[PDB]
Ligand binder design. Sequence first.
Ligand SMILES: CC(=O)N[C@@H]1[C@@H](O[C@@H]2O[C@@H](C)[C@@H](O)[C@@H](O)[C@@H]2O)[C@H](O)[C@@H](CO)O[C@H]1O
Ligand code: CA
Length: 135
Amino acid sequence: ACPEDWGASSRTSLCFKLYAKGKHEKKTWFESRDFCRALGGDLASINNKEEQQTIWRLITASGSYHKLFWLGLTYGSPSEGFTWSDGSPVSYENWAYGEPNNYQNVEYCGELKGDPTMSWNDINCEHLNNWICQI
Ligand SMILES: CC(=O)N[C@@H]1[C@@H](O[C@@H]2O[C@@H](C)[C@@H](O)[C@@H](O)[C@@H]2O)[C@H](O)[C@@H](CO)O[C@H]1O
Ligand SMILES: [Ca+2]
């Protein structure tokens, strides 16, 4: 079961919460990770298409599209490539076309484009974004 405002009550329920903020309250990737971890959770990992649907549904209920959200995607070692901050394997991927491209060699964190594509892009970790936590 999920906490109130994070999901449903069934044993298989996955718990996510959107944090959409104005520019003066958006956070870097590391700040967002720390915020979610302070609650006992982490930045959201999207481990399969079912979790993707869950998050997309939350976005539709928000009444706001096209927003960008930090996910728990962070680059590891050169041989690892991208990892999830919660330690789960990156088995499922939904990178946008041509991503991750490490554009200009400065893109080590992953963001979700909150539109129907639900696609991922690697971007500079110091950008200020909205974020999604899990618990
Ligand atoms: C898919 C791809 O390689 N896109 C390149 C562009 O990078 C993309 O857009 C920028 C603004 C940033 O969001 C990147 O994280 C993203 O991958 C790049 O700007 C452009 C330069 O001419 O080349 C594209 O191919
Ligand atoms: Ca990129």
